[PDB]
Amino acid sequence: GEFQRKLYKELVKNYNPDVIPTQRDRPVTVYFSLSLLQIMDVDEKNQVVDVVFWLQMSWTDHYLQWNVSEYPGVKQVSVPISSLWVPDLAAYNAISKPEVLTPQLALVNSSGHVQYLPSIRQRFSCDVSGVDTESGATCKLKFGSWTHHSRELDLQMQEADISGYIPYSRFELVGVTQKRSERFYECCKEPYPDVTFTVTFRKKG
Amino acid sequence: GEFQRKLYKELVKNYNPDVIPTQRDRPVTVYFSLSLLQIMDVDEKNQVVDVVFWLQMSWTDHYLQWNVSEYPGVKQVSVPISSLWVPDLAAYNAISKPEVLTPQLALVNSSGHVQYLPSIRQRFSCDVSGVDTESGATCKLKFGSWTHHSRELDLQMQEADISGYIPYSRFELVGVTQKRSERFYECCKEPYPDVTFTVTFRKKG
Amino acid sequence: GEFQRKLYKELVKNYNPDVIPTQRDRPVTVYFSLSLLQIMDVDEKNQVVDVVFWLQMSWTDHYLQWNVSEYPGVKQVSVPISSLWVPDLAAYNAISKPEVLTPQLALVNSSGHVQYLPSIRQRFSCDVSGVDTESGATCKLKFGSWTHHSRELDLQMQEADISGYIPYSRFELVGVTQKRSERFYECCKEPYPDVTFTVTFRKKG
Amino acid sequence: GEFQRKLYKELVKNYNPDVIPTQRDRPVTVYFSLSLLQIMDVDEKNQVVDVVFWLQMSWTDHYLQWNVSEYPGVKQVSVPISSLWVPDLAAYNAISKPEVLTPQLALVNSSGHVQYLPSIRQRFSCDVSGVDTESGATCKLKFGSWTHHSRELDLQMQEADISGYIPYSRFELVGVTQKRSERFYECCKEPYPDVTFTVTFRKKG
Amino acid sequence: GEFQRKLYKELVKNYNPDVIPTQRDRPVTVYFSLSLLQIMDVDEKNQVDVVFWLQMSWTDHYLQWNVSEYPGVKQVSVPISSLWVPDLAAYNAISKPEVLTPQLALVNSSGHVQYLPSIRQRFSCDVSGVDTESGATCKLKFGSWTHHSRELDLQMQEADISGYIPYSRFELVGVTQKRSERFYECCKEPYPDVTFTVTFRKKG
Numbered sequence A, B, C, D: 001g002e003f004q005r006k007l008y009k010e011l012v013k014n015y016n017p018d019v020i021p022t023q024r025d026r027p028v029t030v031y032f033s034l035s036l037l038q039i040m041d042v043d044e045k046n047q048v049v050d051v052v053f054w055l056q057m058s059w060t061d062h063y064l065q066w067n068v069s070e071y072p073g074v075k076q077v078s079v080p081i082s083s084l085w086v087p088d089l090a091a092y093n094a095i096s097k098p099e100v101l102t103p104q105l106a107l108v109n110s111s112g113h114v115q116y117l118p119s120i121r122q123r124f125s126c127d128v129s130g131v132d133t134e135s136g137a138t139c140k141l142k143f144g145s146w147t148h149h150s151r152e153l154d155l156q157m158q159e160a161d162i163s164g165y166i167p168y169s170r171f172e173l174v175g176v177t178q179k180r181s182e183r184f185y186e187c188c189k190e191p192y193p194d195v196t197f198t199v200t201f202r203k204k205g
Numbered sequence E: 001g002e003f004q005r006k007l008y009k010e011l012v013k014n015y016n017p018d019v020i021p022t023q024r025d026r027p028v029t030v031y032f033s034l035s036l037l038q039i040m041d042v043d044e045k046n047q048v049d050v051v052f053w054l055q056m057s058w059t060d061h062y063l064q065w066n067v068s069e070y071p072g073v074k075q076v077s078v079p080i081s082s083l084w085v086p087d088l089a090a091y092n093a094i095s096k097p098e099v100l101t102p103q104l105a106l107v108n109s110s111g112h113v114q115y116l117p118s119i120r121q122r123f124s125c126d127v128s129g130v131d132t133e134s135g136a137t138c139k140l141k142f143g144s145w146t147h148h149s150r151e152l153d154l155q156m157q158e159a160d161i162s163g164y165i166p167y168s169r170f171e172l173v174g175v176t177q178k179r180s181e182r183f184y185e186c187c188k189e190p191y192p193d194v195t196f197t198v199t200f201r202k203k204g
Ligand SMILES: *[C@@H]1O[C@H](CO)[C@@H](O[C@@H]2O[C@H](CO)[C@@H](O[C@@H]3O[C@H](CO)[C@@H](O)[C@H](O[C@H]4O[C@H](CO)[C@@H](O)[C@H](O)[C@@H]4O)[C@@H]3O)[C@H](O)[C@H]2NC(C)=O)[C@H](O)[C@H]1NC(C)=O
Pocket: A060, A109, A110, A111, A112, A113
């Protein structure tokens, strides 16, 4: 429709995707979830794990809301992420650039709530020593904002999800636990929240 | 291509390729089919298939129609996909980005019917255990829109053909099946359709 | 440079690189040749041949012509292919993207004749069964417009060249034949021409 | 506050990111530091070392400061590095392109002080012969500006950090030492500074 | 600096990087040299890998300024996007060049440009004699892909083997350089190429 086209036009007007959408007194709450899909490979020589996982990120961008009466049918839109602000979450212990497997698009409803849900393949540093033992190996996948502290970006975990782990992998996914931490570095005065997903796994047999 | 040069300007005038071209608010019906060309490799350790395949996607974009009496010779135009809306179809169980082998061009006729026919190479998660057996290994290649539900994008399948499959391959096709489904996700209130290409194959011998 | 600079401004003005420069009842004739330089590898398990070759494409684009008197001294210009229309030739049986090795520039003279001469590495589907037999293996490299039928794009062979084939190669180049075909598809009224290069080769024993 | 939005647009206004922000014929002082995270691999045949490290770069950009009373709650911004000048530091003995593992953003505070802190994977030419010996192997990681001399870009080093080295690597990090050098080249009229990080390491066992 | 900022603005004004800055209707003279830093690998089966420092320099008359008008500014560092660069091709490369260094050129007030990319690239070569005492000899052939010798005058400077790493498994026996001029039965004018010949053998 032309309404959806006017709306797309207006969402981008006077909008800078480099500007985190805070409102004074308020940090941007970003809800964050990682679903492990497949353990692609263990490098026992170089201490590396290769994983495929589904990230779920959502937050409210209040510069992106619209009155639905002015845009009758339009209740959500699908938008390329280059055109809006997205959390600068970094994989603290990645040793490779992420390979995004899915279309780089976000959903946005009329309250300005954004949902961005990439599927990603990425290699991480990990001690994979015990992978062929009963206890298994344990990898920490650690994520957090690279440039935004707690009072700018409040990173929130959502519940752990192993439901997506492929059942025919040569690795048995023993468990996944998660932890949110606020670290002080002393670059900065402010703490930076990070979310850590702890994956325990072992060779089947 | 004098009339052709005039047409190309009018088509891109006030056109936003981020916007799914609904009307009513009809879903855009998208016709989808996969023709399998070559099974490039099986990874029995990591459970992956490497395949080369030919997609056929077609849909009607109503903003892309013209009066043919106003452009005498012009029945059809060849257009970069970067300038028009294309379905955001994702391979749900891919573990690599799709590698597009063919020119990224679509054919558009005067009533707005678009055809995009890329040949593609891509790796998928798959249990390839029984590839040495006589019942062979079965891989599900699942495709669907990433951000559009049923009432926005009506994904319909067109019939499979295996005649494109290369005959001098080390794998033989034992079975092929396409099938459309409509599932709910924890996600959304609207169902999302998908098309699943199920292929069964084995080592020759 | 004085008139060259002004001429470059004019060639891109009112010019659309997406529009095939046909005229009513006049296809764009595209002269096309392949010169094999080296056979990098043969994959007998996966049925792939890895080749380096030089393509030579030439055609006339009447929108690219100019009056030499108006630009004295300027008889040809070197132009990035991104800025002019180029033939959308695809490698039909390629299983990888082409790796263009040379600068992506085309030479254009004042009557609009374009020459584009890329050196390319690409991998193709092929039955290399006979590579160690020295009746040899035979690969067919197949090329054609992906979106223009023969009354839009008139694909013409020119005599192939093997003088450039590497003499110290692991593989002995037995011979190369070329063939222009015109094939119909159940889809379209108009046939689509292709050029196929048949290369026969064998390991040096 | 929409003061962040106001500030960003002022920062990029009348600003060129290709221009090093010198004042008064005074050089831009760039403070530089390297923290070694992991030695991914040693290639003893081709004499290559593969490493992941964290660079710290900071400097003052006088064009990028703002009076904080004019933009109330804004004390620092997060900014894509393509919108501001950043040091063109190169690894002089790298044998691969640097792979940047983190978001390409820089922090900037109101007095124009910038912090850019990429984590990076890169391979370096290095004599890795002694890696099995007790004295280990020694690799110079040599960095400097590619195009700015001492009087434009005053490269200074802060102290390196081995506290980030992963404890479960197959290589023990014996030590990292750093040294700042400055030399004339016969090529150019002005001298160039460089910072070299000398890494000693051996195989556990 | 504010002088630099407004100088940059002026250099790119009306400037088209696609246009070889021929003046006059003589060539742009392009000075060209190669410094071998490391032989990374040989593929004796497929007959093929090196890391080298290219040096290129030429005058772009469009890029001159008067230093009186820009007091401090004697040279600037610009992205090579923003200016014309030689379309030099590696005639026998079998891979795309991986450019290791920042893509920046130096330009001085006379419009003299220096572009010194460090590059890793694979080349076709008969490496079969590599273990032998006579070694393997490889040719690295470079030249303009679209400009003939009266648009682009390719000239070679002396080669630098001082940068070759001493701890390589290959010993660098010798390097020579030659400028040639070839006519192709197609194109009126000749096209000049500079070819660096590299002889090297396995140590031990
Ligand atoms: C766009 O998507 C977002 C994400 O789904 C969506 O936002 C959510 O909206 C609901 C309802 O407006 C929010 O729920 C509210 O939160 C507060 C405190 O957190 C509660 O107090 C509210 O609660 C209720 O209890 C009342 C009793 O006094 C009842 O009368 C009332 O009915 C409520 O049951 C309320 O639940 C929710 O917090 C947000 N979530 C986020 C992450 O913001 C938004 O509505 C969508 N936009 C549109 C236009 O649909």
